[PDB]
Amino acid sequence: KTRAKAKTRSSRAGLQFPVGRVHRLLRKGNYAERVGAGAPVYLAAVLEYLTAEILELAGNAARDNKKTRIIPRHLQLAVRNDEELNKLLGRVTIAQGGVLPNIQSVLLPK
Amino acid sequence: KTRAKAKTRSSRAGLQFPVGRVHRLLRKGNYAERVGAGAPVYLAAVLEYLTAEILELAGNAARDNKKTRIIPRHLQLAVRNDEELNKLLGRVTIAQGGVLPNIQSVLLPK
Amino acid sequence: PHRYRPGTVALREIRRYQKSTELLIRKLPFQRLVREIAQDFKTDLRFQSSAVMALQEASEAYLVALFEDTNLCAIHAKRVTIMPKDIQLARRIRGER
Amino acid sequence: KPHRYRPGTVALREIRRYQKSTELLIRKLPFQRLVREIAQDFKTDLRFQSSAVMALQEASEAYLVALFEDTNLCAIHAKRVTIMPKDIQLARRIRGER
Amino acid sequence: RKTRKESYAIYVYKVLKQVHPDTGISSKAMSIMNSFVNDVFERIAGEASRLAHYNKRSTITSREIQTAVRLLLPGELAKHAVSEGTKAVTKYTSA
Amino acid sequence: RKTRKESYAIYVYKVLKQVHPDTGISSKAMSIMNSFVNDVFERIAGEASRLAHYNKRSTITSREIQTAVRLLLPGELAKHAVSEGTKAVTKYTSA
Amino acid sequence: HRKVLRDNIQGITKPAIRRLARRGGVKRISGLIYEETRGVLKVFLENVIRDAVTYTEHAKRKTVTAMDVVYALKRQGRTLYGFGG
Amino acid sequence: HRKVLRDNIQGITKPAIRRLARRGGVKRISGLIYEETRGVLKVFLENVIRDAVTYTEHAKRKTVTAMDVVYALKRQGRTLYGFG
DNA sequence: CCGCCCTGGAGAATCCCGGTGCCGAGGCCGCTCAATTGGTCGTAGACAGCTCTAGCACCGCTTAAACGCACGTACGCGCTGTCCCCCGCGTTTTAACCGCCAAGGGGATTACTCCCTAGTCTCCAGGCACGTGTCAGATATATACATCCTGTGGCG
DNA sequence: GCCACAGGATGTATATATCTGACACGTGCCTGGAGACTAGGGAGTAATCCCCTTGGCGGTTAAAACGCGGGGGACAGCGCGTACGTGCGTTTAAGCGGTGCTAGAGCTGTCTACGACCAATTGAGCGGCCTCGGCACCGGGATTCTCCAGGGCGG
């Protein structure tokens, strides 16, 4: 049938994250009785920004490690070397991400 | 429309806490789409048991303090003296409750 | 002269303040501190007396717990004196710093 | 003359090696046996997913490494380089576990 | 004449009377008790919501509440709470 | 044929292509990223629901999400996330 | 009356910090403890008041309430009993 | 198929605890550290496994899944990334 | 004067590069389900008017507490030394791991069906709000009780 | 050159009286919980497919156990000099009480737009399957870290 062209709300808002999927996950998650029109757009934008920031830092870490693929070690290095990312993910353990190289000054051999 | 005499569900289940009020709070808290019939009864019974336990300990503390009225100091004494209540309320500050009287052994004189 | 030894009055104060239940910080100075801090967040703010008292109770409980942990660290280092390094170690282990 | 490294250089080398690496430091079969023995007390005839046991092992190792960092901080605070059961006890007590 | 603010004041007073027949409770202690009851209600109901979401259910049942109680309350508190909840539920279903 | 499951894998890959055109992602790292997206979604949605309930509202709006972001994310992360969200909502409303 | 307050952290006097340490069980206090305690208290208050003011601003109110303070503390995982419900 | 395991806490050997301490950044280790570490690990695993088995029993399943462990850790406030 | 101190190779571990190879990241395709279009409706929310509680501001006073300074004693910190416990390493024993195989218990799905919960209307009674009058509690005070600190008796 | 404590000196639990204010009780009233009913879909149940978990078996070798030497450091002892606790005289501003003002919290009544809902379309991404190179590994070589056996001039 002849209706308007199906333009996704992600493209309408200029995002790469699924506005419709975020809207469904907010509606079906039993968070409130109603979900606004701008709430999925705002939440998708925030999720996209955070994902972009962590991916940028992880790609920089992978490049510094002479590799072209992001691995859990690279994600851990990015998160624990960015101060605000470490603040946001302080109580989060990344699988097979290891720990940062941090040997105490007193333990250093002098 | 004189129907049958009403019976409170607290009296039907042998409880003091309000089963109907607990049911309404469960239904209006966005906790789930549907709420079972026995869920308010169980939750109200658990709340009444916890209230009775903490009130019994606080009344014992008040009696030991030679007073006939429970105050926040007595509530704090009861909670921090009962190991399980302390573990349940470990991330809780009781207003105007003070602290448990303890002095370290190395800080004691000799 | 009846000067007490250095620590008997301290122990007496410990017992007194652990027995009591009041607020150890002066209400007007603490309220002014809260208002000064809140100036930087939103100008022309009004605080309920209940709100100021809630902040004071929370702050005093936090500081008392931190001083308990600080005393634990100082005794671990085999000292009866608490030190800023004791405070820093307690906060670092708790995850605040 | 036989060669012998001084006490501390090999330990530092191990510290660097294990901080740079990211693999599990506990044998999988013994850890799985311990997990199953512990879970026996809670529900008999239990089965486990391999991913479940791996999650338990990774979480436990992360917890133990964090606890050892805090223990090292306590030992340094006490003017020592050796970690001790009292250091572990203080770390847990400050963190709220004891 | 203003909006009524509900509280568990009378229920906590009844429980106190049935436990200690000759004991009172000050206004501050009553407020702390109301906050404690609301806090435990929130804990248990949030845990029950998480359980219902995890099991892809859309209902909070006595089983969900009991599992939430076991998860939250430590040890003997969980055992006694489960026993009392079961007793109350059976006494309700009998009537 | 079994039930199909949803994930943010393709969206995270598209964002990675936008940011670093010559970088790839392993399966485990993609799973960790999906868990991270889910955790941030859960935190923000929970905080916004708390705000809606504590203001006696019944709608999750862009204002609720903005307040939740400002409460959860620290400092510059929160400031930049607020800017990105406001820009996205303005574009969505203009379109 | 438009007035500005400044440097009230010195309003938390040395005797007040001493009393807090005494309630904490501390028998002897170093002289540098007081400024460290003032800094810690200021950081804690800033963190709590930021969230309380955020809640108030969201509520389109100009009055910070005890319930807003309680919500901020609960956000920090420091549940406070006795200031509402 | 009834098998009862016992004294498996010794499977966490001294060199394994040394590797964990090295990863943590520890130079020297006292002799009594290993028993203390085994006890700490045992109590941690007991708590996490108890919560996981509670979730499993509520689900009416018989095998402890990875999501059960993840939810147990989340109940403990120890979010683990990479298992769903 | 003598231990104490300053140094370049030897051995081992780390780094560095090149060839091999694989399996896991990555593109691509039909296809079903979830997102998108488009009217409806009734309610959540926006807003203007209004009431009065409650927060802010100020004056005076009364004094409790904060401030400041002298003194000295207990304490943090540094130095030496003893020995003992942990580290480094070589050798032997152990079982973790890897590969493959089998089978069966249990996860996950799919109809279906009925009973359990949402939703409504009504009623009445349990519970909130509001007076109020007294009894538990704070306080002022004289205790006698409980606890700390130094000289005086005492000698080897 | 120390050991016990008697008694002074001071903090403090006890008993008595005297307000006093808020806590518990009663009572009118109102809105929300219970009774009774209908409607529909959520979950219980039963049968089935298959997958992945456990158990077994064998070979390899990586790791753990174990013993031994020795030296790094933990801990005790001792000393000393700064620094914090104790206490008393000054001061200041906190608490309280009282009055005044008004700003904003709370409520109420209309009214609007907006989001849930539902019918219908369609394309987006999950699943599954080829396909190639990024990274682990083995082989080989250069560099570097660390430690020990010679040269040296010091108050």
PDB file of N, CA, C and O (backbone and C1' of nucleotides) in Angstrom, chain G residues 18 28-31 62-63, chain J residues 83-86 104-106:
ATOM      1  N   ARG G  18      37.829  16.907  66.813  1.00  0.00           N
ATOM      2  CA  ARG G  18      38.302  16.104  67.932  1.00  0.00           C
ATOM      3  C   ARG G  18      37.169  15.288  68.542  1.00  0.00           C
ATOM      4  O   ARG G  18      37.358  14.119  68.885  1.00  0.00           O
ATOM      5  N   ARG G  28      44.390   9.428  70.394  1.00  0.00           N
ATOM      6  CA  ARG G  28      45.404  10.445  70.155  1.00  0.00           C
ATOM      7  C   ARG G  28      45.328  10.856  68.693  1.00  0.00           C
ATOM      8  O   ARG G  28      45.172  10.008  67.814  1.00  0.00           O
ATOM      9  N   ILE G  29      45.434  12.160  68.443  1.00  0.00           N
ATOM     10  CA  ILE G  29      45.187  12.738  67.127  1.00  0.00           C
ATOM     11  C   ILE G  29      46.395  13.564  66.716  1.00  0.00           C
ATOM     12  O   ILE G  29      46.898  14.367  67.508  1.00  0.00           O
ATOM     13  N   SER G  30      46.855  13.376  65.483  1.00  0.00           N
ATOM     14  CA  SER G  30      47.925  14.203  64.952  1.00  0.00           C
ATOM     15  C   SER G  30      47.405  15.598  64.615  1.00  0.00           C
ATOM     16  O   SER G  30      46.210  15.812  64.400  1.00  0.00           O
ATOM     17  N   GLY G  31      48.329  16.559  64.570  1.00  0.00           N
ATOM     18  CA  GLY G  31      47.954  17.942  64.334  1.00  0.00           C
ATOM     19  C   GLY G  31      47.502  18.235  62.921  1.00  0.00           C
ATOM     20  O   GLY G  31      46.758  19.197  62.709  1.00  0.00           O
ATOM     21  N   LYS G  62      12.793  25.408  44.259  1.00  0.00           N
ATOM     22  CA  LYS G  62      13.904  26.212  44.741  1.00  0.00           C
ATOM     23  C   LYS G  62      14.309  25.848  46.159  1.00  0.00           C
ATOM     24  O   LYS G  62      15.263  26.427  46.685  1.00  0.00           O
ATOM     25  N   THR G  63      13.613  24.906  46.788  1.00  0.00           N
ATOM     26  CA  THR G  63      13.858  24.522  48.171  1.00  0.00           C
ATOM     27  C   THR G  63      14.429  23.112  48.199  1.00  0.00           C
ATOM     28  O   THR G  63      13.760  22.163  47.783  1.00  0.00           O
TER      29      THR G  63
ATOM     30  P    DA J  83      56.880  18.291  65.399  1.00  0.00           P
ATOM     31  O5'  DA J  83      55.481  17.675  65.862  1.00  0.00           O
ATOM     32  C5'  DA J  83      55.452  16.426  66.551  1.00  0.00           C
ATOM     33  C4'  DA J  83      54.273  16.363  67.504  1.00  0.00           C
ATOM     34  C3'  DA J  83      53.355  17.570  67.462  1.00  0.00           C
ATOM     35  O3'  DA J  83      52.073  17.182  67.888  1.00  0.00           O
ATOM     36  C1'  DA J  83      54.273  17.439  69.577  1.00  0.00           C
ATOM     37  P    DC J  84      50.889  16.963  66.832  1.00  0.00           P
ATOM     38  O5'  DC J  84      49.739  16.283  67.710  1.00  0.00           O
ATOM     39  C5'  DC J  84      49.972  15.018  68.313  1.00  0.00           C
ATOM     40  C4'  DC J  84      49.537  15.003  69.768  1.00  0.00           C
ATOM     41  C3'  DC J  84      48.214  15.695  70.067  1.00  0.00           C
ATOM     42  O3'  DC J  84      47.543  14.987  71.085  1.00  0.00           O
ATOM     43  C1'  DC J  84      49.903  16.683  71.348  1.00  0.00           C
ATOM     44  P    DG J  85      45.941  14.913  71.116  1.00  0.00           P
ATOM     45  O5'  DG J  85      45.621  14.603  72.647  1.00  0.00           O
ATOM     46  C5'  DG J  85      46.435  13.686  73.359  1.00  0.00           C
ATOM     47  C4'  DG J  85      46.598  14.109  74.808  1.00  0.00           C
ATOM     48  C3'  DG J  85      45.360  14.723  75.445  1.00  0.00           C
ATOM     49  O3'  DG J  85      45.289  14.330  76.794  1.00  0.00           O
ATOM     50  C1'  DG J  85      47.124  16.269  75.544  1.00  0.00           C
ATOM     51  P    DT J  86      43.904  14.434  77.592  1.00  0.00           P
ATOM     52  O5'  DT J  86      44.220  15.486  78.744  1.00  0.00           O
ATOM     53  C5'  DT J  86      45.439  15.396  79.457  1.00  0.00           C
ATOM     54  C4'  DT J  86      45.637  16.612  80.336  1.00  0.00           C
ATOM     55  C3'  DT J  86      44.349  17.288  80.794  1.00  0.00           C
ATOM     56  O3'  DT J  86      44.427  17.535  82.186  1.00  0.00           O
ATOM     57  C1'  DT J  86      45.788  18.875  79.785  1.00  0.00           C
ATOM     58  P    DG J 104      10.879  32.302  45.271  1.00  0.00           P
ATOM     59  O5'  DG J 104      10.794  30.746  45.596  1.00  0.00           O
ATOM     60  C5'  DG J 104      10.974  30.271  46.943  1.00  0.00           C
ATOM     61  C4'  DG J 104       9.861  29.342  47.368  1.00  0.00           C
ATOM     62  C3'  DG J 104       9.330  28.399  46.284  1.00  0.00           C
ATOM     63  O3'  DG J 104       8.997  27.120  46.854  1.00  0.00           O
ATOM     64  C1'  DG J 104       7.564  29.533  47.238  1.00  0.00           C
ATOM     65  P    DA J 105       9.461  25.724  46.142  1.00  0.00           P
ATOM     66  O5'  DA J 105       8.704  24.584  46.963  1.00  0.00           O
ATOM     67  C5'  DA J 105       8.854  24.515  48.369  1.00  0.00           C
ATOM     68  C4'  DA J 105       7.554  24.105  49.034  1.00  0.00           C
ATOM     69  C3'  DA J 105       6.821  22.952  48.360  1.00  0.00           C
ATOM     70  O3'  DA J 105       6.295  22.080  49.348  1.00  0.00           O
ATOM     71  C1'  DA J 105       5.411  24.854  48.447  1.00  0.00           C
ATOM     72  P    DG J 106       5.787  20.612  48.946  1.00  0.00           P
ATOM     73  O5'  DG J 106       4.204  20.784  48.809  1.00  0.00           O
ATOM     74  C5'  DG J 106       3.435  21.140  49.950  1.00  0.00           C
ATOM     75  C4'  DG J 106       2.030  21.551  49.555  1.00  0.00           C
ATOM     76  C3'  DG J 106       1.327  20.603  48.578  1.00  0.00           C
ATOM     77  O3'  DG J 106       0.239  19.957  49.231  1.00  0.00           O
ATOM     78  C1'  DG J 106       1.000  22.909  48.002  1.00  0.00           C
TER      79       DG J 106
END
